[PDB]
Design a protein around this motif. Structure first.
Motif, PDB file in Angstrom:
ATOM      1  N   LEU A  80       0.831  -1.207   0.000  1.00 42.56           N
ATOM      2  CA  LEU A  80       0.000   0.000   0.000  1.00 42.56           C
ATOM      3  C   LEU A  80       0.868   1.262   0.000  1.00 42.56           C
ATOM      4  O   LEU A  80       1.004   1.961   1.005  1.00 42.56           O
ATOM      5  N   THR A  82       1.005   4.179  -0.342  1.00 47.16           N
ATOM      6  CA  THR A  82       0.743   5.314   0.554  1.00 47.16           C
ATOM      7  C   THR A  82       1.234   5.075   1.988  1.00 47.16           C
ATOM      8  O   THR A  82       0.977   5.935   2.842  1.00 47.16           O
ATOM      9  N   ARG A 115      -1.767   2.607  -4.920  1.00 44.22           N
ATOM     10  CA  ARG A 115      -1.872   1.243  -5.404  1.00 44.22           C
ATOM     11  C   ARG A 115      -1.089   0.332  -4.474  1.00 44.22           C
ATOM     12  O   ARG A 115      -0.265   0.784  -3.675  1.00 44.22           O
ATOM     13  N   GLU A 116      -1.352  -0.966  -4.577  1.00 42.88           N
ATOM     14  CA  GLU A 116      -0.643  -1.966  -3.794  1.00 42.88           C
ATOM     15  C   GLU A 116       0.456  -2.592  -4.641  1.00 42.88           C
ATOM     16  O   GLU A 116       0.303  -2.757  -5.856  1.00 42.88           O
TER      17      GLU A 116
ATOM     18  N   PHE B   6      -9.148   5.587   1.553  1.00 44.76           N
ATOM     19  CA  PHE B   6      -8.326   5.287   0.383  1.00 44.76           C
ATOM     20  C   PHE B   6      -9.025   4.411  -0.655  1.00 44.76           C
ATOM     21  O   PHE B   6     -10.028   3.751  -0.364  1.00 44.76           O
ATOM     22  N   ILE B   7      -8.505   4.419  -1.880  1.00 44.32           N
ATOM     23  CA  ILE B   7      -8.894   3.477  -2.921  1.00 44.32           C
ATOM     24  C   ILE B   7      -7.630   2.958  -3.585  1.00 44.32           C
ATOM     25  O   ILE B   7      -6.789   3.746  -4.033  1.00 44.32           O
ATOM     26  N   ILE B   8      -7.500   1.638  -3.652  1.00 41.18           N
ATOM     27  CA  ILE B   8      -6.378   1.007  -4.339  1.00 41.18           C
ATOM     28  C   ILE B   8      -6.667   1.060  -5.834  1.00 41.18           C
ATOM     29  O   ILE B   8      -7.617   0.432  -6.307  1.00 41.18           O
ATOM     30  N   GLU B   9      -5.853   1.801  -6.588  1.00 41.69           N
ATOM     31  CA  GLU B   9      -6.023   1.760  -8.035  1.00 41.69           C
ATOM     32  C   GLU B   9      -5.312   0.543  -8.608  1.00 41.69           C
ATOM     33  O   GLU B   9      -4.630   0.639  -9.633  1.00 41.69           O
ATOM     34  N   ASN B  10      -5.506  -0.613  -7.973  1.00 38.82           N
ATOM     35  CA  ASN B  10      -5.051  -1.905  -8.478  1.00 38.82           C
ATOM     36  C   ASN B  10      -6.119  -2.984  -8.402  1.00 38.82           C
ATOM     37  O   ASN B  10      -6.094  -3.909  -9.216  1.00 38.82           O
ATOM     38  N   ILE B  69     -10.300   0.182   1.591  1.00 40.09           N
ATOM     39  CA  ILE B  69      -9.541  -0.503   2.626  1.00 40.09           C
ATOM     40  C   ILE B  69      -9.853   0.016   4.025  1.00 40.09           C
ATOM     41  O   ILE B  69     -10.032  -0.781   4.950  1.00 40.09           O
TER      42      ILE B  69
ATOM     43  N   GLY C 274       5.953   1.695  -9.928  1.00 37.57           N
ATOM     44  CA  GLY C 274       4.744   2.025  -9.193  1.00 37.57           C
ATOM     45  C   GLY C 274       3.602   1.049  -9.371  1.00 37.57           C
ATOM     46  O   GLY C 274       2.454   1.472  -9.553  1.00 37.57           O
ATOM     47  N   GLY C 275       3.886  -0.251  -9.319  1.00 36.02           N
ATOM     48  CA  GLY C 275       2.868  -1.269  -9.434  1.00 36.02           C
ATOM     49  C   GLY C 275       2.469  -1.620 -10.851  1.00 36.02           C
ATOM     50  O   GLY C 275       1.753  -2.608 -11.051  1.00 36.02           O
TER      51      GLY C 275
END
Ligand SMILES: CCCCCCCCCCCCCCCCCC(=O)OC[C@H](COP(=O)([O-])OCC(O)COP(=O)([O-])OC[C@@H](COC(=O)CCCCCCCCCCCCCCCCC)OC(=O)CCCCCCCCCCCCCCCCC)OC(=O)CCCCCCCCCCCCCCCCC
Ligand code: BCL
Ligand code: BCL
Ligand code: BCL
Ligand code: BCL
Ligand code: BCL
Ligand code: BCL
Ligand code: BCL
Ligand code: BCL
Ligand code: SF4
Lengths: 143, 102, 358, 61, 15, 362, 358
Positions: A80, A82, A115-116, B6-10, B69, C274-275
């Protein structure tokens, strides 16, 4: 799930055991999903990695047992970006990577992109994350 | 407030059900496109500067991909308001009545 | 007509895994630029961790070939590990057989790869660096048993030549790179420095005399060279966890080239930053080296790239764009993709990046 | 209306009508072959006259 | 920014 | 159905000037529907050349070259203000300054350079017996005094990295050529017959500049050519400063969007028309290095080129012995297209150096 | 379009004789890559033996040319013989004329060719070896009378440059390879070592000063260089029993090349073992050199090879296959042969070998 009952090009990473898996825990995750939530430095230079599950009930550590459960294809670990215990400038690294292919109609979608990033375990180096064509390790390096 | 969301952009598929529950007076959630939407190119974000920690997006229990999350105030990262208990499973077949195993 | 048929399949794996099934076929009805024909070859590669506690992987490669009715075989096993971020160490053995002749070899070598600069202005401003100039410092210790009288002859001639002429260090490059390999060196940006023979001594080993020869060289790169610019990428030891296999080989004659390469290995997809995952930037040295040999005939290409992403994995910025799709089974065919395939088969360097992420 | 066909109920007049229709169809085949040839020949940017051997510049001619 | 327009284009290679 | 056509469209326009003047308006547009041979795409560039005569008392000219580029989202820029002059028929000097910016990084430089171009031979048996000598071997000796302020962190890091490399590595003199030719630049070095000698360094040191440390580097290198090298074999008239009386400008650019190359080239500079004797002039015979270098990228896709050359002549001047022959003549402007000229255009786009001489007089 | 037309004829001789008349024609509609046009050549090579006692053979070469209306000529005759299996000795004169200028020269040059290895492992296993890496050592003393003023100017400038400049020994390779010659040096695998000059002295001869130069150099090859790898085959003196002549030349304009080649010489056929002969392996240097120049225009080729074996000889394993065997009159045209012709015209070195026996 059986190979002959699944979509043709499915790897064991996406083939789930425990044939009735989706109703045992979250259906989104084929394997239990853990998050690196804190990496603090105390006393010596070693950092304490905290693996809190996506269920958010426990507060675990990498540990040989969960490392084995990782390398046995049963759990997954994410960071994560962030995360406030980061070493690399992810805010600049995310933003300048979306600027390659994102047009800011909203003028803030790239700014608030989080993003993760998955974590894998080799052995010689510990829990190491491969980011931007370079293999960082949670031990020192990436934090 | 605390416990940012938050929001995971994945995992996010851009469905916007999180945006439906965000108060209109705070445009915390939005859209970024970067391409065609037929290929998941309509991810959503949470503007942490505008988010006021409503819990509406997360407590609504509508994120289908687990992108919302709600990181807890200390460090805990949730994924969905409640998660099933991770049970061991097997098929129960009787010996010579109802079923006959074999 | 000279139509060049080719089907490529890329099946990736998800999560933190970077593995990928790569099977490709080629059928070109054109004469190969081999001065000896027919040139039938079989290449088999394998690698598996020995002890990932310190990085040893046992990589074994077997080359079997029949060029003008001359059966050639080269088997090699190596225990390669990244001793340092810039230094690599290896140890292993092998054998080389041509017809009746066959000489076995055992070796121990260390390759140290340096980059001329490590500026972070480039790193934080070039999102996908490609050209990275540098120099590899091979340090090779190899021992070859001298059983055949031909081994004795080679060893005696070599030691007499080293003792006689002082230009053996630079004139070996003429021998070392047989035929067009020398021209390939220059076109790929490579430059071989004069080798430093640190000693050629023979000792009576287990069954006979063994020719132990210390030598080293420093081969550089203008940026195109794959062995330098992507030193940490060509050897994914950290992200290896199971036996990885690549089975190549071509059947070639005076009137056609047939290629069939299989694959199983990590590093097919690398994190773009970045993923965002991506297919690894195309190794430039194979393209430029096929460059002097793919330009000899004009060809019609019907190339089919079938990239199969894992579940949940979408795509972005395919250039040339994927032609058809089946929700994972992205397919590149005709249009700009066949044009790019012709471009790279004739030696082109044009980028075809596949930025994919779930 | 052009006189190539007729609304005639006698077989002899329809003889001429069919002859005219067949001739115009053959003429259409010839002109269509020439015109498809020209369409292909423009589609490949090779406007060179096959008899005298000159070329033809699309941007200036 | 000319790249971005090509980056943000729907697949136009349909049959 | 047909083979892979991959058409390429391009037009070229040359407008000359009469009398002793050698000026010429060159205008060129191109469009190739082929993937450019760049490992990072798409690429863009906006090349500006600006030239003004400073003082004809001894030959100062103010040349400004601004390059702006977009390569895979990276904004690249490089400007060079320079005051070049011919101190001697064989020696050239230049005092200049400029800057380069990549993304957010940017460092200014100021340089005092001198280039000496020496031809190996001056045989009269060549001059009076070869009316149009193309190849002429020589060697250029660069002597550069470049001063770069070190006000960024990476500027300082580069400086100590370089000085450590010089102090430790004894092969830095020739290994600099590997770093100093990025990618296929070293391969193009051999294509034109360019041999870079090992650089020889008079020293690296830093001193207190007007506002901070300034890295001053005195280094020399020499490059020799086998005859293709237009910067050597054609050294004297690649710098028409004596025949420069009014400002000269060239605007060039290309789009490299991974599905094609779209080129826009302008031009206003003297030297376009070079005399051929007996009152007969000619367009300057084509530079060898551009053709040979572009051959390294023009052979990856077969193409049916559709070229169009439009040469415009001043009043009274009539063209003769144009090979291949001009297609048409509308009064005073001649046009080339198709036939042998298109074959020559494909030949030179794939790297060929065939002769296409345009002779004209009155 | 760019049609390419060419006809090749090879009529052979039987028995122990390897003789064969080779005359070929070629027509190309593509512009040549010569910066000066039009360019023409006339080449006349004639060889006759002095006496079998020591292998001396008269060899005369005339190179008439007209490039951009500039008259060029080069007539050389030399007594050339192999004094040893690795060293060749030559003595001869010659003159070079450009326009009105002309200088006659005399030289006594001895050349020794040395392979890097002579292993029996290669010889007994590879039946048709192609690459032989090695160094060929030149040793030339050349005396040029200084009668006109320009020769004196060149002589004085050269002696001044060699005495003063210390980098002459490697900067001579820049001047000494006109234009693309330097690039073809590496595109074929040649390495020219630094020349070392044993002295530049002068003396009065029959009429005036003579510029005597005693220099030597060595060019090394990676295997494609036919002047090294085929040293024993370029100069077949033992099978030269009658005068051998080869006339050739091209009429090249701004829009075409017209080639005529005439030949009659031994060494066209080489034995392959067991009473089975074959056409000699194609020299790779001409192919890789013409590839540097024969890739600038796409072309459709109409080539007709025609070999006429002696009475009783029959071709076996023609690859690509011949079309019609009108008795010993064998012909190749179109199909795979045209593809191979385009291959070699673009620089390919693929095997087209013709095997026959009686
Ligand atoms: C009745 C239905 C019969 C059964 C239907 C099968 C459904 C299976 C399916 O849809 O999957 C796609 C399936 C294969 O997809 P794929 O393997 O992934 O490859 C995708 C393509 O390569 C290329 O993929 P793509 O991404 O480029 O586009 C996908 C395309 C895929 O559609 C097709 O491939 C078939 C299109 C047939 C068009 C027929 C036109 C009328 C001809 C009469 O879908 C369409 O858009 C079809 C709309 C056609 C509009 C074309 C004209 C627009 C130009 C306007 C000017 O296509 C089919 O097999 C359908 C063929 C049968 C349909 C026609 C049957 C007769 C109808 C005519 C009436 C008589
Ligand atoms: C008309 C244009 C044709 C074309 C024309 C040709 C021609 C013509 C030829 C090929 C040849 C090849 N082509 Mg192609 N080719 C085209 C399209 C294709 C396509 C496709 C569309 O998919 C494919 C897969 C290929 C693939 C191939 C290869 C199978 C083959 C050369 C083998 C090689 O790599 O060995 C690599 C060789 C080496 C690396 C040997 C290295 C030797 C030197 C001395 C050793 C160096 C030192 C060494 C590196 C040290 C190693 C140490 C260890 C690293 C530690 N081509 C286009 C369509 N191609 C060539 C071939 O072999 O055919 C049989 C050939 O002649
Ligand atoms: C090829 C370009 C560079 C080069 C780049 C490298 C690189 C990069 C490396 C070495 C390494 C080594 N090199 Mg080196 N090296 C070259 C030329 C040489 C030459 C020679 C006579 O020319 C020699 C003797 C060596 C010697 C050596 C050994 C000391 C050592 C490993 C040997 C081995 O594993 O072989 C086994 C040979 C093979 C397995 C055959 C296949 C070789 C090709 C290149 C592999 C293709 C992999 C394929 C694309 C992906 C399939 C992988 C599957 C997972 C199996 N190098 C050329 C100049 N060399 C390794 C090292 O560091 O040791 C410390 C290393 O990582
Ligand atoms: C680094 C390359 C591989 C190797 C790969 C091959 C290949 C490939 C071939 C041979 C072949 C042969 N090998 Mg072996 N071979 C090697 C090591 C040796 C050694 C030794 C003392 O180390 C010896 C005596 C030999 C002996 C022989 C020659 C007698 C024989 C046929 C001639 C020839 O081609 O030689 C080739 C010579 C070399 C490649 C290396 C010779 C090493 C010399 C004697 C000692 C090292 C000198 C110097 C320090 C190293 C210079 C760099 C290398 C030249 C690249 N090999 C190393 C392990 N060997 C041929 C064959 O098997 O069947 C024809 C052949 O095609
Ligand atoms: C109704 C007639 C069609 C047509 C039918 C043909 C055909 C058929 C042919 C040409 C061919 C030619 N045409 Mg036309 N062509 C058409 C419209 C054009 C246009 C335009 C609109 O700008 C142009 C530039 C040309 C130009 C040309 C040259 C490429 C070429 C020889 C010139 C000629 O014959 O006179 N055509 C009209 C629309 N044209 C001839 C050619 O290319 O020969 C190689 C050829 O065979
Ligand atoms: C390119 C082939 C040779 C070369 C040949 C020359 C030639 C020839 C000259 C120099 C000159 C210079 N060279 Mg040098 N030089 C080369 C590589 C270098 C490198 C390097 C890091 O690679 C450096 C630092 C230098 C350094 C220098 C300075 C000493 C000097 C001034 C340059 C200038 O003002 O820039 C300004 C930058 C430009 C103007 C960019 C445009 C460059 C291109 C090549 C020009 C295209 C012209 C265009 C076709 C038509 C122009 C018309 C407009 C009216 C201008 N050279 C290569 C090796 N060099 C000049 C001199 O003599 O100084 C005394 C000079 O005349
Ligand atoms: C001659 C070429 C131009 C120049 C053009 C560029 C370009 C183009 C780039 C950089 C870039 C950078 N520049 Mg600069 N740069 C020059 C002069 C300097 C000097 C100096 C003391 O003179 C310094 C410290 C720097 C510093 C930096 C590097 C730290 C940084 C990225 C690494 C790189 O490859 O750079 C290249 C470094 C050089 C070519 C000169 C290195 C000078 C060294 C320190 C002193 C001279 C050593 C030696 C005598 C010179 C050998 C020949 C040179 C290689 C030409 N530049 C001269 C004026 N510079 C990058 C950037 O701006 O954003 C990423 C980049 O892409
Ligand atoms: C070409 C590749 C190598 C080369 C390979 C050879 C070979 C091989 C030989 C020499 C030989 C000679 N070389 Mg050397 N040599 C080269 C470059 C040179 C150069 C130079 C300025 O570049 C010079 C001065 C020399 C000097 C010499 C003399 C010492 C000597 C006698 C040649 C002669 O009299 O005319 C002889 C030349 C001709 C009369 C013209 C014909 C030349 C062409 C190339 C031959 C084509 C043959 C034709 C295809 C078929 C022949 C059939 C006809 C019946 C002849 N070489 C290049 C680097 N050199 C000869 C020798 O050994 O002397 C002791 C010899 O056998
Ligand atoms: C091996 C080459 C042939 C030869 C072939 C040609 C050709 C071809 C040409 C000339 C031409 C000329 N020749 Mg001559 N010429 C030779 C020998 C000489 C000698 C001498 C002392 O031996 C002298 C003074 C000259 C003089 C002259 C130059 C003044 C003149 C035009 C410059 C040029 O490029 O020349 C070329 C210079 C050389 C190739 C040899 C220079 C020899 C120097 C003076 C002494 C040897 C220096 C060093 C020891 C050897 C280095 C290797 C040589 C470069 C081969 N020649 C040798 C025999 N000569 C031109 C002409 O005829 O009309 C314009 C021309 O096109
Ligand atoms: S917590 Fe409230 S303000 Fe924040 S994203 Fe969710 S609904 Fe919007």
């Amino acid at each position: 799930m059986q190979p002959q009952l699944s979509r043709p090009q499915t790897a064991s990473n996406q083939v789930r055991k425990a044939v009735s898996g989706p109703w045992s825990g979250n259906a989104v995750h084929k394997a239990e999903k853990y998050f690196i939530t804190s990496a603090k430095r105390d006393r010596d230079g070693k950092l304490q990695i905290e693996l809190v599950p996506a269920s958010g009930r426990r507060k675990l550590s990498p540990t040989p047992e969960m490392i084995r459960r990782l390398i046995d294809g049963e759990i997954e670990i994410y960071i994560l970006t962030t995360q406030p215990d980061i070493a690399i400038d992810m805010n600049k690294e995310i933003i300048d990577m979306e600027n390659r292919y994102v047009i800011d109609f909203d003028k803030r979608g790239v700014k608030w992109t989080m993003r993760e990033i998955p974590v894998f375990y080799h052995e010689g180096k510990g829990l190491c994350v491969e980011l931007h064509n370079k293999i960082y390790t949670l031990d020192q390096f990436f934090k | 407030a605390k416990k940012h969301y938050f929001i995971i952009e994945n995992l996010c598929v851009g469905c916007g059900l999180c945006l439906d529950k965000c108060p209109p007076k705070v445009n915390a959630i939005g859209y970024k496109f970067y391409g065609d939407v037929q290929e998941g190119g309509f991810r959503c974000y949470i503007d942490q500067a505008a988010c006021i920690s409503c819990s509406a997006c997360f407590s609504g229990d509508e994120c289908p991909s687990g992108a919302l999350i709600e990181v807890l105030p200390d460090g805990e990262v949730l994924d969905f308001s409640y998660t099933p208990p991770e049970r061991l499973d097997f098929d129960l077949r009787f010996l010579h009545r109802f079923h006959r195993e074999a | 007509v000279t139509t060049a048929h080719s089907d490529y399949e890329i099946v990736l794996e998800g999560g933190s895994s970077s593995w990928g099934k790569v099977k490709a076929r080629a059928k070109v009805n054109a004469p190969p630029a081999s001065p000896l024909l027919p040139a039938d070859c079989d290449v088999k590669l394998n690698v598996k961790p020995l002890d990932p506690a310190k990085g040893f992987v046992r990589i074994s490669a077997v080359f079997e070939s029949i060029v003008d009715s001359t059966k050639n075989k080269l088997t090699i096993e190596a225990d390669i590990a990244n001793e340092t971020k810039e230094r690599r160490i290896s140890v292993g053995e092998g054998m080389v057989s041509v017809g009746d002749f066959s000489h076995t070899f055992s070796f121990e070598g260390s390759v140290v790869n340096l980059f001329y600069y490590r500026s972070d202005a480039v790193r934080r401003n070039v999102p996908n660096p490609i050209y990275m100039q540098g120099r590899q410092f091979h340090d090779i210790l190899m021992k070859v048993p001298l059983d055949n009288n031909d081994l004795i002859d080679t060893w005696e001639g070599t030691v007499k030549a080293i003792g006689s002429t002082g230009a053996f260090n630079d004139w070996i490059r003429d021998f070392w790179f047989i035929g067009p390999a020398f021209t390939a060196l220059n076109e790929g940006g490579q430059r071989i420095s004069r080798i430093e023979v640190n000693g050629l001594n023979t000792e009576s080993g287990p069954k006979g005399p063994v020719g132990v020869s210390r030598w080293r060289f420093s081969h550089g790169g203008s940026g195109m060279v794959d062995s330098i610019s992507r030193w940490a990428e060509l050897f994914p030891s950290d992200k290896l966890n199971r036996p990885a296999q690549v089975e190549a080989g071509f059947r070639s004659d005076s009137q056609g080239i047939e290629v069939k390469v299989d694959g199983e290995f990590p590093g097919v997809s690398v994190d773009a930053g970045g993923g965002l995952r991506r297919i690894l930037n195309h190794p430039l040295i194979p393209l430029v080296h096929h460059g002097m040999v793919g330009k000899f005939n004009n060809f019609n290409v019907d190339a089919q790239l079938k990239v199969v992403l894992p579940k949940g994995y979408k795509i972005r910025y395919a250039a040339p764009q994927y032609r058809s799709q089946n929700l994972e089974e992205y397919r590149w065919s005709g249009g700009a993709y066949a044009r790019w395939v012709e471009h790279v088969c004739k030696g082109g360097v044009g980028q075809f990046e596949i930025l994919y992420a779930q | 209306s052009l006189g190539i066909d007729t609304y005639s109920t006698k077989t002899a007049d329809l003889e001429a009508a069919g002859a005219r229709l067949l001739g115009w169809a053959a003429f259409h085949f010839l002109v269509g072959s020439v015109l498809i040839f020209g369409g292909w020949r423009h589609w490949t940017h090779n406007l060179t006259n096959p008899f005298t051997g000159r070329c033809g510049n699309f941007r200036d001619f | 920014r000319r790249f971005l327009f090509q980056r943000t284009e729907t697949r136009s290679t349909k049959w």
